Assembly symmetry: D2
Homo-oligomer: 279 residues x 4
């Protein structure tokens, strides 16, 4: 079994065009076939996520909630989430990451099916210095990770989507804090790399990986999603749809979810899914 | 005679669900939507403001804005139990208005342009009657619509007409004398079952006490009430601010330029925020004409 | 061998006055002419021999921009569509150009983006017989050729711009054909000489492959002021995020090995140019 | 009373949303009441402007064309345009410039009515180092101009709209190339400043002055104009409209222009001008 964690650090309640930002990472985990999900946020925001999503049983999900008292690093998700993870495999997604593209279901599926080691994704960006950066040898094997380097060794940033085996809790517990006293995800990923158990999969230029964490980037992500949805008459990262297509809820349950929203474009969309075949 | 302000940040029901943080708490680029109508009232020289919203949203506005004393304002809060029309602001706000002149602004309206201070100033200085603004739009049937005679005098108002008599919509910014509370009290619900601001404005028109000022095409009046319109407004503000290195509708700036807060107060506001905090600090050091 | 045709048809006065200055398919989508997108699409399919068909007025302007294409390892030719009497007319105008070869037709104002696009074109291109088209879920199918599917997902009807669409699956402006298409086009009667009638002829012989182009691909129309602006913002967002260009023909020629490092360096020097130089030094997976 | 020059150093043929870029500076000169306009461009581009605009008699204009053989600086417009200007006052519209705002007609009118000296506009920008920069004293009087300073003395850039008396040709003739080896408009403006004949008017933050000279800025200008026009049902910088409202063309001339465009939003708009009162 693989359990999911969304870290919504100290924003993920803001809309990207037509739905809350958190619908995107939630939909990402759901596409990977993960239905048991811990949402970690600030003391102030955790209750607001609870109020919005509840226990998730309406979407065939099992949602739980935990607080990050202070932003002491992303790897703190594994300590906060230790009892939630138990003895299971896990996946970690960041709250302000948006993914789009063809074969994304297959790309997540393959990473998810690995019973041992860790899987991350490398994506060519203009500004790699803002992220974890992967260095490759001539043969395309990952040989180094650097967190926000002044002099990036490549243009390949590690995305905010991480797949882990049962070692991650123990690796997180044994992490030496950074000079700033923070538990860094890059140190978790380097631990797997040093054991020869880090799979770095290329996320090709044919995929969109967008940040939604600045005023400018949120606006650009909004326009991007609006253009796709208005062209297609299909929604990106509609959790009700992904639950339906995963068979976690049936036609009758989707109809019940649509009814209260029926006066607006979202409820009308959910109803139309019942009457058309989408390939 | 003092003029008090009302922002009606009404419920949109389930219209913007599931995206809706309430509508007027959503950002237009870099600041909450409510900063725009708040900045509008402040530019008109209004410091005493009632914010009317849903029971669920009222606490979130209070948490964001507080009593407004940090910005030289006196902010109060009231609830609209149900969205039974915009003219209900004058009943909810009756004791707040008391014997004073008033201004009403809608929560999802954005204004921009040169002479906007002068345009508000002139409307605000009228001690009697009411002032509204007429703006040429593509879809007037969505608004209150003004009909003009050959001489350019307003002769009719219609709320959301099937057959608009012009392309001039009344904007969500209204200036009133002490008659508005009494006019609002006598209003009966419209065919749509609402207490309509257009009925308030028609009452002033019939007494020959409605000033309809043209808001020229050189001004931007933007609606932020749909997913699409909010996105367009965001890009519009982003383009202006990134070009100018100046912010549109930064309340701290307007308070400072009105001399409602001094350099020392602005510095105290800037420190905890130190792009927004950096912007507030630059206001202290730069001459902007 | 498979030869390519780009039909950059007249839009009449539809986009005037913006298109009084520059033809529709010469208008930029963010950072490059519209025609770079369909050209790059044919190049990604491995097609090097391409006929560009346009109006009498616009054909010379395409020639002035692109020349014979030898700079990009291409063989570009030009022909005129006297009047916009239908898309199937490309096969009559292009008859002697096509000769005895397989063909592909792309429309001038169609933009494609997505992962596996090289593989999707590759598979369609490798079919030596019949025709291949792509079906894409759209909001407004009534604007396009519309595919009807049976319960088993087999294509059973095509209708051009139906009042009552039988699905939300539009046929995209990208078509792969065997040696039958010229003969089918010759026998077509006006409805315009419609590409949907060509595709239905292949369907009736059981030789039409309708591949689903999934929602994970972007198929954008650039034929209105609004749609061109949206396409511009879409490409700008991808390119500024990635530090990579969409549909840069020099890059696709280089990665296809149609031009070498020395040829790319010669193209970069007079110039976009900084981007071409970076291609020489960086491994992009 | 005043002749116009558009220096188009091609960029100015590209559309800003729904019309060629050059419609914007042309509409600007027309709003100032200028009907006699010289378009200066490269040998290659001058014919393309001629093909688009012709002699301008359709819009009640008198359009002429001249070539800049080599890009030796924007002040060369006054040498190339010397015989065109003759003994008249002039206005120059330079760069890839878009203007919008309330009182713009009045702002141009006032600058235009000055019978002596020169008038320029100063606008607060984020990146003044890209432009001519105005320094002000404590009393707000202009005291220095610098072309693209490394250390700008203010955030006030001089816009690409210049009003000149009959001295400009003689000042241009006496100019020597700058360190960058160009005849610079800033040197023309400084000559007027030194003789106490430069009026620097503030263009307030309530006006939009947009650059359309990069891929990014052209896209942003497109979205800006699209937002205004689709909101208002009114067009920005439609030359036919400005000619009609200036009474340079009559209803019969406007009808002839509108009919061939009538199946699109532009011709429908020109027809609406015949029947509708817009204040
Ligand atoms: C745009 N995509 C997207 C979808 N396509 C995936 C195509 C299936 C493989 N042929 N499906 C269909 C879908 C089909 C089967 C199943 Br089981 C689940 C979902 C949706 O329901 N919602 C989507 O939003 S996505 O890029 O993969 C994605 C998804 C989620 C967040 C972010 C991005
Ligand atoms: C963009 N404008 C705008 C400003 N300009 C006003 C023009 C100067 C008068 N000559 N000032 C300066 C300003 C100067 C003096 C005083 Br007292 C108050 C404010 C700001 O501080 N913030 C602004 O945001 S605005 O269109 O009028 C507007 C304003 C508010 C909401 C919406 C729209
Ligand atoms: C965005 N893509 C895109 C690319 N990706 C394709 C990735 C295949 C990797 N296995 N390549 C790389 C590329 C790699 C190998 C070869 Br041989 C040719 C080109 C480019 O050079 N330019 C591109 O622009 S695209 O969607 O396929 C496309 C392409 C053309 C027009 C429109 C859209
Ligand atoms: C948006 N404006 C704009 C207009 N407003 C001016 C309002 C004056 C009210 N007293 N008029 C009306 C107009 C009215 C009377 C006469 Br005579 C000429 C033109 C237009 O016809 N076209 C416009 O496009 S503008 O900012 O000045 C401008 C103008 C040009 C380029 C860029 C920007
Ligand atoms: Br990492
Ligand atoms: Cl986050
Ligand atoms: Cl790819
Ligand atoms: Cl289905
Ligand atoms: Cl009204
Ligand atoms: Cl105006
Ligand atoms: Cl045509
Ligand atoms: Cl086309
Ligand atoms: Cl569509
Ligand atoms: Cl078809
Ligand atoms: Cl897909
Ligand atoms: Cl200057
Ligand atoms: Cl101003
Ligand atoms: Cl550029
Ligand atoms: Cl149009």
């Amino acid at each position: 079994k693989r359990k999911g964690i969304i870290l919504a650090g100290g924003k993920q309640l803001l809309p990207v065009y037509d739905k809350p930002m958190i619908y995107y990472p939630l939909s990402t985990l759901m596409l990977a076939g993960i239905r048991e999900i811990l949402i970690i946020s600030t003391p102030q925001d955790t209750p607001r996520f609870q109020q919005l999503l509840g226990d998730g049983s309406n979407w065939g999900l099992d949602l739980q909630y935990a607080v990050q008292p202070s932003p002491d690093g992303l790897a703190q998700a594994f300590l906060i989430g230790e009892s939630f993870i138990g003895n299971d495999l896990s996946a970690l997604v960041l709250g302000d990451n948006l993914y789009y593209g063809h074969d994304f279901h297959e790309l997540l599926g393959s990473a998810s099916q690995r019973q041992t080691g860790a899987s991350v994704f490398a994506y060519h960006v203009l500004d790699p210095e803002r992220y974890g950066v992967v260095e490759f040898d001539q043969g395309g094997k990952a040989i180094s990770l650097e967190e926000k380097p002044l002099e990036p060794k490549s243009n390949y940033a590690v995305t905010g989507l991480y797949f882990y085996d049962q070692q991650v809790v123990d690796i997180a517990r044994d992490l030496k804090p950074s000079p700033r006293g923070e538990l860094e995800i890059t140190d978790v990923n380097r631990a797997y790399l040093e054991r020869g158990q880090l799979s770095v999969e290329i996320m090709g230029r044919g995929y969109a990986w967008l940040d939604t964490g600045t005023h400018d980037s949120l606006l650009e992500a909004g326009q991007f999603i609006a253009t796709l949805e208005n062209r297609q008459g299909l929604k990106v990262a509609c959790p009700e749809e992904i639950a339906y297509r995963q068979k976690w809820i049936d036609a009758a349950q989707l109809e019940k979810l649509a009814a209260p929203l029926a006066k607006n474009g979202y409820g009308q969309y959910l109803k139309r899914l019942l009457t058309e075949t989408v390939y």
